[PDB]
Specification:
Serum Albumin, Chain A, Domain 1, DNA-binding, Telomere binding protein TBP1
Length: 85
DNA sequence: TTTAGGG
DNA sequence: CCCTAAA
């Protein structure tokens, strides 16, 4: 499949979704926040959560592409610490 | 088919 | 994004 960087709203929709469902229900996350975004499958969302956690763990100057608002990176690490077992 | 992780 | 063992 063709590349397709995640936009800020998509991240936003993902972050909101996970804060409510967690990290073990990507099919529900997909249904809740990307139900009509045919190019994003629950495996892609699982993957974007994996990169987002990393993105939030590195310095801003080493991130690539459109900048994810600090606000979201913040909720990624808080939702990651919460749903971690 | 979905979950869960490495490739 | 892909590949796919397990469930």
């Amino acid at each position: 499949r063709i590349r397709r960087p995640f936009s800020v709203a998509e991240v936003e929709a993902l972050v909101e979704a996970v804060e409510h469902l967690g990290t073990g229900r990507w099919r529900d996350v997909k249904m809740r926040a990307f139900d009509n975004a045919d190019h994003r499958t629950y495996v892609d969302l699982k993957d974007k959560w994996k990169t987002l956690v990393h993105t939030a763990s590195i310095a801003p100057q080493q991130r690539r592409g459109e900048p994810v608002p600090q606000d979201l990176l913040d909720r990624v690490l808080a939702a990651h610490a919460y749903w971690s077992q």
